[PDB]
Design a protein around this ligand. Sequence first.
Ligand SMILES: CC(C)(C)NC(=O)[C@@H]1C[C@@H]2CCCC[C@@H]2CN1C[C@@H](O)[C@H](Cc1ccccc1)NC(=O)[C@H](CC(N)=O)NC(=O)c1ccc2ccccc2n1
Ligand SMILES: [Cl-]
Lengths: 99, 99
Amino acid sequence: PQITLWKRPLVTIKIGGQLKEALLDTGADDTVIEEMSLPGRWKPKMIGGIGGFIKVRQYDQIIIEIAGHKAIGTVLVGPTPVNIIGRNLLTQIGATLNF
Amino acid sequence: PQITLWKRPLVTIKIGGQLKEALLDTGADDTVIEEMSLPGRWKPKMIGGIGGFIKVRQYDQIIIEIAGHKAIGTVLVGPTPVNIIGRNLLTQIGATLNF
Ligand SMILES: CC(C)(C)NC(=O)[C@@H]1C[C@@H]2CCCC[C@@H]2CN1C[C@@H](O)[C@H](Cc1ccccc1)NC(=O)[C@H](CC(N)=O)NC(=O)c1ccc2ccccc2n1
Ligand SMILES: [Cl-]
């Protein structure tokens, strides 16, 4: 599978039993999802990007499916305008940047 | 070359005749470089990310070298925390995401 970048590399994910669209993002350390109820324990975190920081809820050991690939890892929930799959999960689904 | 994502995908770039380090970022539509003196005509623009928008200088038709590959395109210059190479130039150097 190879994804060119003339458009946003959006894929379908399954998280908390719901389908969402998310951006495959090699520039993001972390995976950040829009506000949603997720069951289970979490802890407060702040994460930064181009316009500054947002508060998120950090959930560890979340089961997620990304474009058909299974993953288990940390998901941050908070007011991102776009759902983002960052390197912590891109490494699990085997993504590489070929240039 | 193929980049795994266990670490940040940082590469050397050449802009304005100066070497810098920048992040290869499939989640960014645009290329944003830290404040620097750069010759060329520009115009103001807002660009956004997590945390909101920042004001930048939009330079069109800038010659940039990214990991040894020459590209020409729009560069935004402003108070970004990190230099980022986004899809407008990743496509020009032929970068793909594979998995
Ligand atoms: C998600 C998080 C874990 C916080 N990581 C990061 O944000 C790190 C931070 C690094 C240090 C500072 C400079 C940016 C780098 C790159 N990144 C990721 C990097 O990939 C980040 C991910 C992202 C995408 C969409 C919207 C928000 C955020 N992209 C961006 O910050 C780019 C900047 C640009 N080109 O205009 N934003 C966008 O391309 C973009 C697209 C759609 C939008 C819709 C509404 C509002 C904003 C929107 N921004
Ligand atoms: Cl919900």
